[model samples]
Target: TEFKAGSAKKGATLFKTRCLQCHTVEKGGPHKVGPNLHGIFGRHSGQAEGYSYTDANIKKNVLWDENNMSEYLTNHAKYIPGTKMAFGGLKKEKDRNDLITYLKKATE
Candidate 1:
């Protein structure tokens, strides 16, 4: 998928405001409100262990790359109904770029 390069440093700020409540990207991190997002890129949906997922999330089996991740980040309810993440989607293209960019580094 076509991925854009955003500032990872800026993405760290975005992560704190947009995603830290629900997720962590460090490898071997524990699941928070959502799953630990380690190694999420190119991984299948609902692959995080020890986290309960909705059937929609688990069965969809979509690969997590820049394209799908961007869509999903726009609105989880609209993109994947029955998803369990309670937070609203990030909703901005620029911010989502930062978040995904940060995930690429932090989740590794």
Candidate 2:
């Protein structure tokens, strides 16, 4: 579950290219097709208020951290069965790491 530290700048590019259509990461950002990922780190999965989530996701009962986030990003459905997220997942470890890095920076 370990990966090389990644660049936030590059991660932002990935976010723009892959995630921006569905997700937002700014303060008071609206929930698009996906939930706004503001302060996503350390929060429980599917706990963002006002965002619609599958019952499976709402009951996942796992906290989000770098490791679990990486696993989820690699394959969301595999990580959490019946969750509503439809992402195909980031295949590259570096990409997932960079995305996690960017998320930490953005959320913090």
Candidate 3:
């Protein structure tokens, strides 16, 4: 994966700045404005309990993994149209790299 060389340390900082308000990485982390992402990598999208997801996201229904997840972060609205989120996306490759690398383990 292109994210293989990313720095998890850098990614940690990136997360706080980019995603913490609406999301969480800790296991069983509470769902905030967005669902907690602890089990995200291998799980199906839109399956988090008690979280409301749009039909657009549920219908996309692909197991989360590097390829798609990277794309999703690059632009969520474009990635899943009708999914509700105010954050736009990670526009830089390095940002995407570090964040995905961090998420690979942070969510576990």
Candidate 4:
């Protein structure tokens, strides 16, 4: 499953700039505001332990499928309505895809 490097690279930059403060993806990175995102793509919303997730994020309708992840990346509150993700969203399809891909691969 080859992915577009441009989007993934861009998303990597975006992650470091916007998400690394609260989240970590390295194998043994420390947890901060959110859990490490090593395998978040196929995970359930709010399933990360040691992270305080809102009721809405836990009650979200589905797991982190591709479409669900992509949509949530663009609007966490829109999808879950009360998620703890305060960064708003990626707001771009390419960024969302890239971020998802990066998350999936980071677990490997």
User: Predictions ranked by TM-score, top down?
Assistant: 2, 3, 1, 4
Candidates' lDDT values, in order?
Answer: 0.70, 0.73, 0.73, 0.64
Q: Give the better candidate number (2 or 4) by TM-score.
A: 2
The candidate with the higher TM-score, 1 or 3, is 3
Write down the worst ten-residue block by lDDT for model 4: 1-10
Clashes of each: 0, 0, 0, 0
Instruction: Sort by lDDT, best first.
Output: 2, 3, 1, 4
Q: Is candidate 1 or candidate 4 better by lDDT?
A: 1
For model 3, the run of ten residues with the poorest summed lDDT: 1-10
Best by the TM-score measure: 2
Write model 3 residue lDDT over 54-99, tens digit each, in one string: 7778876777887778877767755567676576657788888888
Candidate 1's error at 64, in angstroms? Answer: 1.2
Segments of candidate 3 deviating more than 4 angstroms: 1-4
lDDT of 1 by residue, 76-106 (tens): 6555576765656567677888878877775
Q: By the TM-score metric, which is better: model 1 or model 4?
A: 1
In model 1, residue pairs whose N, Cα or C atoms come closer than 3 Å (at least 3 residues apart or on different chains), thus clashing, are none
List runs of model 2 lying over 4 Å from the truth. Answer: none
Model 2 TM-score, all chains together: 0.82
Q: Between the candidate structures 2 and 3, which one is better when assessed by TM-score?
A: 2
